[PDB]
Scaffold this active site. Structure first.
Site, PDB file in Angstrom:
ATOM      1  N   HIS A  99       0.820  -1.216   0.000  1.00 16.77           N
ATOM      2  CA  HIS A  99       0.000   0.000   0.000  1.00 16.77           C
ATOM      3  C   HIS A  99       0.860   1.275   0.000  1.00 16.77           C
ATOM      4  O   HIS A  99       0.353   2.345  -0.142  1.00 16.77           O
ATOM      5  CB  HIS A  99      -1.088   0.018   1.051  1.00 16.77           C
ATOM      6  N   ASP A 147       0.155  -7.650   1.853  1.00 18.28           N
ATOM      7  CA  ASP A 147       0.589  -6.244   1.873  1.00 18.28           C
ATOM      8  C   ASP A 147       2.100  -6.134   2.093  1.00 18.28           C
ATOM      9  O   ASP A 147       2.564  -5.850   3.148  1.00 18.28           O
ATOM     10  CB  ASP A 147      -0.196  -5.451   2.906  1.00 18.28           C
ATOM     11  N   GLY A 189       1.331   7.049   8.670  1.00 19.62           N
ATOM     12  CA  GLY A 189       2.707   7.410   8.397  1.00 19.62           C
ATOM     13  C   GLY A 189       3.725   6.394   8.898  1.00 19.62           C
ATOM     14  O   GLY A 189       4.888   6.502   8.571  1.00 19.62           O
ATOM     15  N   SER A 211       3.098   3.285   8.191  1.00 20.79           N
ATOM     16  CA  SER A 211       2.810   2.307   7.226  1.00 20.79           C
ATOM     17  C   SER A 211       4.098   1.872   6.548  1.00 20.79           C
ATOM     18  O   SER A 211       4.896   2.678   6.257  1.00 20.79           O
ATOM     19  CB  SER A 211       1.956   2.934   6.097  1.00 20.79           C
ATOM     20  N   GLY A 212       4.245   0.580   6.387  1.00 20.82           N
ATOM     21  CA  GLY A 212       5.397   0.022   5.736  1.00 20.82           C
ATOM     22  C   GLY A 212       6.577  -0.264   6.647  1.00 20.82           C
ATOM     23  O   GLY A 212       7.473  -0.925   6.275  1.00 20.82           O
TER      24      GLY A 212
HETATM   25  N1  LIG Z   1      -2.109   0.613  13.276  1.00 15.26           N
HETATM   26  C1  LIG Z   1      -1.846   1.603  12.249  1.00 15.26           C
HETATM   27  C2  LIG Z   1      -2.337   1.067  10.917  1.00 15.26           C
HETATM   28  C3  LIG Z   1      -2.433   2.161   9.892  1.00 15.26           C
HETATM   29  C4  LIG Z   1      -1.651   2.320   8.753  1.00 15.26           C
HETATM   30  N2  LIG Z   1      -2.044   3.425   8.054  1.00 15.26           N
HETATM   31  C5  LIG Z   1      -3.074   4.043   8.655  1.00 15.26           C
HETATM   32  C6  LIG Z   1      -3.831   5.175   8.375  1.00 15.26           C
HETATM   33  C7  LIG Z   1      -4.862   5.544   9.242  1.00 15.26           C
HETATM   34  C8  LIG Z   1      -5.157   4.801  10.394  1.00 15.26           C
HETATM   35  C9  LIG Z   1      -4.423   3.658  10.716  1.00 15.26           C
HETATM   36  C10 LIG Z   1      -3.395   3.277   9.868  1.00 15.26           C
END
Ligand SMILES: NCCc1c[nH]c2ccccc12
Ligand SMILES: [Ca+2]
Length: 223
Positions: free
Chosen positions: A40, A84, A175, A177-178
């Site tokens: 993602h 993912d 943020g 993420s990854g």
């Molecule tokens: N536990 C955080 C997971 C997550 C990744 N990107 C996001 C964006 C909005 C809310 C949670 C997330």
């Protein structure tokens, strides 16, 4: 990271920032030329930033290297977020040192109750928005499959796990993420998804890296 701590500069040497004019995602350096991140997180024009603490200031330990190629997992479904995971190859090999170092891939999957370290530059509020400039860290346990499935009925595949706290207050966030989940010195997870951040009964969900080791190795060997 919500409810975490300031890691300290370059204490998480495998943590990278993916930058496309701004930080948008985390990643994990797994060898001198490859980064593992979330599918993602895919976009064009990625520069990998290694050796970072404050992402807004050049502090002297950074290496900035453009990506030459990105490989999203062939089975990634953006709707379900199943599979993912994504690999990013650097245009040039990073220079490895104490502050820029790879993280080992798992030889086995980690169990529920294992303690892990989750890290990133994501939002530190569960309701507001505040982005930290320095790397934040969270120590969190992996949760049972049953509890994870209970938290998120109909959404948890064999390629995902929950880590965190059912009580809320401590979680990965936007943020992050990854980014890495490292347990006992191995990369076991990738920050993938959740419902909000740090909400009661909604722990973070992570890509299960142990399931991908063969794909990662074979892919690296041929690319
Ligand atoms: N536990 C955080 C997971 C997550 C990744 N990107 C996001 C964006 C909005 C809310 C949670 C997330
Ligand atoms: Ca910096």
């Amino acid at each position: 990271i919500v409810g975490g701590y300031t890691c300290g500069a370059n204490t998480v040497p495998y943590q990278v920032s993916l930058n496309s004019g701004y930080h948008f995602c985390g990643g994990s350096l797994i060898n001198s030329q490859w980064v593992v991140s979330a599918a993602h997180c895919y976009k064009s024009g990625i520069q990998v930033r290694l050796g970072e603490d404050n992402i807004n200031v050049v502090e002297g330990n950074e290496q900035f290297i453009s990506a030459s190629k990105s490989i999203v997992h062939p089975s990634y479904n953006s709707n379900t977020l199943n599979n993912d995971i994504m690999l990013i190859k650097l245009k040039s090999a990073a220079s490895l040192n104490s502050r820029v170092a790879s993280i080992s891939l798992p030889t086995s999957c980690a169990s529920a109750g294992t303690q892990c370290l989750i890290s990133g530059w994501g939002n530190t509020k569960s309701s507001g928005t505040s982005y930290p400039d320095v790397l934040k860290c969270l120590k969190a346990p992996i949760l049972s499959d049953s509890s994870c499935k209970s938290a998120y009925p109909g959404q948890i595949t064999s390629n995902m796990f929950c880590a965190g706290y059912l009580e809320g207050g401590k979680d990965s966030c936007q943020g992050d993420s990854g980014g890495p989940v490292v347990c006992s010195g191995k990369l076991q997870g990738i920050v993938s998804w959740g419902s909000g951040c740090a909400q009661k009964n909604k722990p973070g969900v992570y890509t299960k890296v142990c399931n991908y080791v063969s794909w990662i190795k074979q892919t690296i060997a041929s690319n």
